[PDB]
Tab-separated table of N, CA and C and ligand atoms in Angstrom:
chain	number	residue	atom	x	y	z
A	1	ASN	N	18.202	3.755	-5.172
A	1	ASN	CA	16.940	3.745	-5.036
A	1	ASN	C	15.782	3.659	-6.176
A	2	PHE	N	15.198	3.348	-5.659
A	2	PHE	CA	14.418	2.437	-7.190
A	2	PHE	C	12.917	2.926	-6.820
A	3	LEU	N	11.978	3.553	-7.781
A	3	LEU	CA	10.240	3.649	-7.347
A	3	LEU	C	9.875	4.123	-8.640
A	4	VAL	N	8.922	3.182	-8.664
A	4	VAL	CA	7.667	2.818	-10.083
A	4	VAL	C	6.273	2.853	-9.422
A	5	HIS	N	5.436	3.896	-10.372
A	5	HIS	CA	4.039	3.803	-9.657
A	5	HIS	C	3.269	3.446	-11.412
A	6	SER	N	2.113	3.260	-11.344
A	6	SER	CA	1.594	2.858	-12.742
A	6	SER	C	-0.273	2.777	-11.723
B	1	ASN	N	-0.300	0.685	-9.423
B	1	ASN	CA	0.416	-0.523	-8.712
B	1	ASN	C	1.453	0.313	-7.818
B	2	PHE	N	2.280	0.433	-7.370
B	2	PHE	CA	3.334	0.738	-6.640
B	2	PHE	C	4.526	-0.072	-6.367
B	3	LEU	N	6.047	0.300	-6.620
B	3	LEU	CA	6.883	-0.510	-6.120
B	3	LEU	C	8.039	0.777	-5.649
B	4	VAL	N	8.476	0.049	-4.798
B	4	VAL	CA	10.041	0.929	-4.350
B	4	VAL	C	10.860	0.040	-3.815
B	5	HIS	N	12.297	0.182	-4.108
B	5	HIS	CA	13.543	-0.276	-3.561
B	5	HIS	C	14.609	0.355	-2.847
B	6	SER	N	15.299	0.077	-1.967
B	6	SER	CA	16.488	0.745	-1.732
B	6	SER	C	17.613	0.150	-0.942
C	101	CL	CL1	17.602	0.664	-6.325
C	102	CL	CL1	1.974	7.832	-12.415
């Protein structure tokens, strides 16, 4: 799983 | 921005 927030 | 992959 992969999650990114900016 | 938000991105999620599973
Ligand atoms: Cl992934
Ligand atoms: Cl953040």
